[PDB]
């Protein structure tokens, strides 16, 4: 209980918090790392590999700043809201089968299914780690 209480609350929050702090500090780091390449390198002689950088930047920027690509999301959202309203309506209509649902679901096979699931999880973890090892052990041979 103590271990679980520690993990489930004290550590999870610090993990997430630390990750967001990393992201923020990554942004700040790039911002500074960007200004450094501005003020000091403002000697007008900025070229060479810059072209390639702004080429890539222009390519990705052009790919992003498209009407269709930007429009697809907006279309999708409404396209979702349609189903939202439709589903909510059709749900409210068939919002009567509650006892059948709760009692229908509550059963015994569920307990067995949970067990089978845990077993699957174990087998899966084992396989995953086995493959991981198979990779790590191969990248060795990749050098020799």
């Amino acid at each position: 209980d103590a271990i679980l209480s520690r993990h489930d609350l004290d550590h999870t929050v610090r993990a997430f918090n630390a990750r967001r702090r990393h992201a923020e500090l990554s942004r700040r780091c790039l911002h500074l790392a960007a200004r450094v390449q501005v003020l000091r390198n403002r000697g007008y002689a900025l070229s060479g590999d810059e072209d390639e950088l702004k080429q890539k930047l222009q390519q990705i920027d052009k790919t992003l700043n498209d009407p269709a690509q930007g429009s697809r999301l907006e279309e999708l959202w409404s396209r979702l809201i349609v189903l939202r309203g439709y589903a909510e309506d059709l749900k409210d209509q068939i919002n009567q089968a509650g006892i059948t649902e709760s009692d229908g679901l509550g059963e015994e096979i569920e307990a067995k299914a949970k067990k089978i699931l845990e077993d699957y999880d174990k087998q899966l973890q084992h396989l995953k780690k086995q493959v991981e090892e198979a990779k790590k052990d191969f990248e060795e041979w990749e050098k020799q």
Binding site: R14, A18, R21, H22, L25, R27, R28, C29, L30, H31, L32, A34, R35, Q37, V38, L39, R40, R42, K54, L57, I60, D61, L64, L73, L76, W77, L80, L83, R84, A87, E88, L90, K91, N95, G98, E101, S102, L105, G106, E110, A113, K114, L117, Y120, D121, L124, L127, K128, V131, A134, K135, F138, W141
Partner: protein
């Protein structure tokens, strides 16, 4: 705590650099492309966030539609865990296939 204090030294210093930065500004007083690069790199984060919101809402609608008189039930539980297993199994399969492919290279 180490990872947590590393986000204290490498923050106070990041704040410390700003003085030498303002000093550099002070020196220069006596670009937009990068500023475009940062916003360009930053803009997609919002898209990721919005996309995440969308996915969450879709999950909400599907889950609530399929079942909405007992959200604390063991069905959606099995569904979710079982999805997890599906994903992990897919990962295993794909990566294993990749390693299998990697061996053909050694078959020279």
């Amino acid at each position: 705590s180490n990872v947590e204090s590393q986000q204290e030294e490498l923050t106070a210093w990041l704040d410390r650099y700003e003085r030498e930065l303002d000093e550099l500004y002070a020196k220069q007083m006596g670009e937009r492309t990068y500023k475009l690069a940062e916003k360009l790199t930053d803009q997609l984060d919002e898209m990721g966030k919005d996309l995440a919101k969308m996915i969450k809402e879709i999950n909400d609608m599907s889950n609530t539609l399929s079942k909405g008189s007992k959200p604390d039930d063991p069905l959606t539980q099995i569904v979710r865990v079982l999805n997890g297993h599906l994903a992990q199994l897919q990962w295993i399969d794909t990566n294993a296939a990749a390693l299998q492919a990697k061996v053909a290279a050694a078959q020279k």
